[PDB]
Amino acid sequence: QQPWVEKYRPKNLDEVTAQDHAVTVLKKTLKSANLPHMLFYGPPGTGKTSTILALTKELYGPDLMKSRILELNASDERGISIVREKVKNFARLTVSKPSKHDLENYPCPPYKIIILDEADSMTADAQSALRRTMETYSGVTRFCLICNYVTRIIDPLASRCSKFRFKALDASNAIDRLRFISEQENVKCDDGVLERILDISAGDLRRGITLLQSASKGAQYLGDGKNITSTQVEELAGVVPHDILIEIVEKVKSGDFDEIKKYVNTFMKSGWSAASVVNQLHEYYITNDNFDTNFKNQISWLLFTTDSRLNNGTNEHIQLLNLLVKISQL
């Protein structure tokens, strides 16, 4: 059939949850026709594409959508030539006349929306040609820039476009949506479940939905009919078990380089991810009251540096070994 992520994608603006500010601004500007240029940004999987698609289908309708909406993303070319020719020509084009049915059952605003999703991957050379393009063609065309990092957007474009930030979907934001999806999909879960799912999928709901779907499929294949336990979704996500983490901590406490290296080799043999173990080590060390302030400061900086190095695409084994040696020699 369809994946649960695409099956429960919000069709209308009333289904997007916890993005109350931007969605209510869009709903209120639906009644009027003064929608400004928008710059949607936030953590991945927070509901930007879903929100813009819902607004697009609400403003124009399925038939008018094709004739009044242009969508460009990283899958297609978005160079300086593309911005100069395609976007400019589309914006210059007069808005198509809506049919009687469209005017009756849809607001049909006099403007059109150019959706540039994943705009953070666009070069600054191609972002300079959009400045006047989104300004002179403002009363006949609207621009929606979607990105994950506002820093990649040049200052002029950030000033021209309205700044709508999508909040991270934590266990207190998307929990209602996750419970709705579980109830609609007939998923049996224990108490406390879907909370670990939202926590592991920090600042994201698509990962949480995928984890829920995978756990449901595993439970169905098992045939026991019992509810899904927390450890199941923890192992399924890729979270290192607590016993392995405490063994790592104990090896760190005994500041023997050879023992630490051997156990790190065994851990890399196990196949776990460096990011997850680093996050779990952060959660263990920061929360533990036994440590003092100076040690916590130093370990926080070391974990920050290790995560920064890992994000650059480095070897997990070396970074993990260096981090554990640094923690031992602290």
Partner: protein
């Protein structure tokens, strides 16, 4: 012909080295319709590609292991493609940096639950992943990508969010020794004792492929026989790295640095990845008993700094030579 290919399992039930992962693959194959995008992360030599093949056979019946090799062309990027029934192979190694265009064209051609397997997804550049983060999300009704990578660290967050994370632990010593015993039972080598298989497993560091290849090499060297004192046929580049480690821990001079640079140039000419070269040099330096704990800590710190520098850099010789110079200064 090769023993690795000779004893490659061709089904989910034939896999007898993960158990729990095999059961999870059965659970995933129970409902082939709702198949999420799969990302296999684990140590090299585990058998992730074999697991993907077995899962595809479970979904698409027999004939998945078929090999319909053909040649494509992109703009002149004429990358070869390995086609199969409901199975396509994409290797980011054959197109570095310029992978975005070719993967876009291949994905749009496949779109036309077809599965396309992109091995070693870590080699994908940040632009190809930027295209894929939307390619997977948009056409998720006619194609299901399954990607296998050693470590998902250089994989962008959106791709890991849209895909499903499945871990493939490396084979354990007892089970890999059992696999070696099955190999030597199917093709008799008349092993003197089973301890040599355990030593081979220990010398493979969880790499079943390495264990099988070295077992075949030793059997061929000993004339289809095995010996308790049979030499371990390690790869040549590992021996060169060990010799370089000995040179570093013995000759602490600038001429020795030039010799080390020449050795590194030879290794790079052998098309050995720079990051793994630095990793093996570091771990071989840590295995030297003469060096004290402070020296080893400095070695690992320099290794981390210089592998980050190599990751954020174009030319690889600079970082390797800098790491060698730093460790040489630390030694004396």
């Amino acid at each position: 012909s090769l023993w690795v290919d000779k004893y490659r399992p061709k089904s989910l039930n034939a896999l007898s080295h993960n158990e729990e992962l095999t059961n999870f693959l059965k659970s995933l194959s129970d409902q082939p319709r709702d198949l999420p995008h799969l990302l296999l992360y684990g140590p090299n030599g585990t058998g992730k590609k074999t697991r993907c093949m077995a899962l595809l056979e479970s979904i698409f019946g027999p004939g998945v292991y078929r090999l319909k090799i053909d040649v494509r062309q992109f703009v002149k990027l004429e990358l070869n493609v390995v086609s199969s029934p409901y199975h396509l192979e994409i290797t980011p190694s054959d197109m570095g940096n310029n992978d975005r265009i070719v993967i876009q064209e291949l994905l749009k051609e496949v779109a036309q639950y077809k599965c396309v397997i992109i091995n070693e997804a870590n080699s994908l550049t940040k632009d190809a992943q930027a295209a894929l983060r939307r390619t997977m999300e948009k056409y998720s009704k006619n194609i299901r990508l399954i990607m296998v990578c050693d470590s998902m660290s250089p994989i962008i967050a959106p791709i890991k969010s849209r895909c499903l994370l499945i871990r493939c632990p490396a084979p354990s010593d007892s089970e890999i020794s059992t696999i070696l015993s099955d190999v030597v039972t199917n093709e008799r080598i008349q092993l003197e004792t089973k301890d040599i298989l355990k030593r081979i497993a220990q010398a493979s560091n969880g790499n079943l492929r390495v264990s099988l290849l070295m077992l075949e090499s030793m059997a061929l060297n000993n004339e289809l026989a095995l010996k308790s004192s049979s030499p371990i046929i390690k790869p040549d580049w590992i021996i060169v790295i060990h010799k370089l480690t000995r040179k570093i821990v013995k000759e602490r001079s600038v001429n020795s640095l030039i010799e080390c640079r020449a050795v590194l140039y030879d290794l790079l000419a052998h098309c050995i990845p720079a990051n793994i070269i630095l990793k093996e040099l570091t771990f071989s330096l840590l295995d030297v008993e003469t060096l004290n704990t402070t020296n080893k800590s400095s070695i690992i710190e320099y290794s981390s700094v210089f592998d980050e520098r190599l990751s954020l850099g174009n030319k690889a010789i600079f970082h390797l030579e800098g790491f060698i110079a730093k460790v040489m200064c630390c030694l004396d």
